[PDB]
Symmetry: C3
Subunit: 155 residues, 3 copies
Amino acid sequence: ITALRQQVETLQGQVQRLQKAFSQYKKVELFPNGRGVGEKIFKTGGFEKTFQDAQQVCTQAGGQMASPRSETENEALSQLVTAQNKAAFLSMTDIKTEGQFTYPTGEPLVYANWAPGEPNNNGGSSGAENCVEIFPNGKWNDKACGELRLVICEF
Amino acid sequence: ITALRQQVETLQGQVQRLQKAFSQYKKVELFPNGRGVGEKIFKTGGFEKTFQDAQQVCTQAGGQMASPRSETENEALSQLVTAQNKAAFLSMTDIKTEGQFTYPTGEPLVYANWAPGEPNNNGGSSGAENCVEIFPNGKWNDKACGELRLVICEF
Amino acid sequence: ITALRQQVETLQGQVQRLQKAFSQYKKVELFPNGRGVGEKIFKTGGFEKTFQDAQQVCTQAGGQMASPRSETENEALSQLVTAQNKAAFLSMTDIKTEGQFTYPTGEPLVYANWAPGEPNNNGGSSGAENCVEIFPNGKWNDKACGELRLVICEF
Ligand SMILES: OC[C@H]1O[C@@H](O)[C@@H](O)[C@@H](O)[C@@H]1O
Ligand SMILES: OC[C@H]1O[C@@H](O)[C@@H](O)[C@@H](O)[C@@H]1O
Ligand SMILES: OC[C@H]1O[C@@H](O)[C@@H](O)[C@@H](O)[C@@H]1O
Ligand SMILES: [Ca+2]
Ligand SMILES: [Ca+2]
Ligand SMILES: [Ca+2]
Ligand SMILES: [Ca+2]
Ligand SMILES: [Ca+2]
Ligand SMILES: [Ca+2]
């Protein structure tokens, strides 16, 4: 029918405006504590927690901790860490097998950006160092999971 | 026609992607200062104001102060109060009739979570206590409306 | 066909709910650091940077610095500056031609709200004053671009 055609063209307009409005509100939301990379979105809570606290926080929020699988994804996190001037915990650990860092899924790294001479598993008073922190410069450093670091969740 | 069918199937795809993208951006927005319960959304501004200031703030923002009508809704607020480590004002008062706390609409409570021995209307120097604050543990305490408390708005 | 009609009516419902949900999530996002005026959206990052830093920040985020072209737009910014209690940089400068303040595009002001006796180009130790800051009261004051001021981006 011809009226059905009218309803469809109306929907096209409505959908177009929804798309425009949403694109704008994506940018607004991400400023300043969020970064979009691919279909991923990293966002910092602005606070610091231990690794396991941060892991619960991100999960409770409906996401997970950041698993940067590329340089572009790693760069985004670097920007958040820089803006906050606080090193942040990544999602990876080598708790299962020492020396081998893994994603929460069980699969080994497909990307890495260790700083000079890392990891080393030397946390001093803290003891072992099974988690990973990322610096403002984007470099990685294994660190005692019990330390407090910037919380960044991946959605 | 057959072309109209094509336009419709195109809209289905567009709408599906809008839905997926929006679900993701809902989670992103709510982290970390927001909680979704039913069709309600609680969000903290992170700051503290008197009851009447908080009431103007929430209204100006297009919402209202939190009227937790269930344990699930009350729990959500508890999580926000805990994260901020700041007690927050609820929307209810007994200003009209002493002893009887009411929603901004005029209707009496359909849910309550008073702490041991509350309310008591004893604010000391503050005087009377006609408003309600909620603790990190989720318990309620009547308090002088003139006090500064965490602002949480309901949308 | 009749089934196509069913799919279309289904889309209408889906779109209606998307619209409702989005309207709600617009209000949530804007609280408390955002203001909507027309098709524009102002949002503060909460931090302070020099004019050129703020300009990079806003651009990187996919927007620009605030170009208030009316009293309603200026009022919105005033509300953000007030809430933060921090004067903010606007997008306008007179760097090209002294005395004549311009938008980033190259066009002269279509609106202005200078405070008593401004601008004056007297920044003391700072030197010249080619940028513009806005006070909680909404009034404008030219200021050394090298100063640190509240960052507010326009999307
Ligand atoms: O506090 C322990 C940390 O000390 C830093 O200076 C580095 O040496 C890191 O490798 C180490 O994890
Ligand atoms: O400051 C007054 C408050 O003091 C607290 O210790 C409690 O006793 C509350 O009941 C009371 O509202
Ligand atoms: O610090 C310089 C500033 O000092 C303020 O008191 C005002 O006089 C401004 O006009 C001037 O830009
Ligand atoms: Ca180790
Ligand atoms: Ca180390
Ligand atoms: Ca009372
Ligand atoms: Ca009391
Ligand atoms: Ca000047
Ligand atoms: Ca001046």
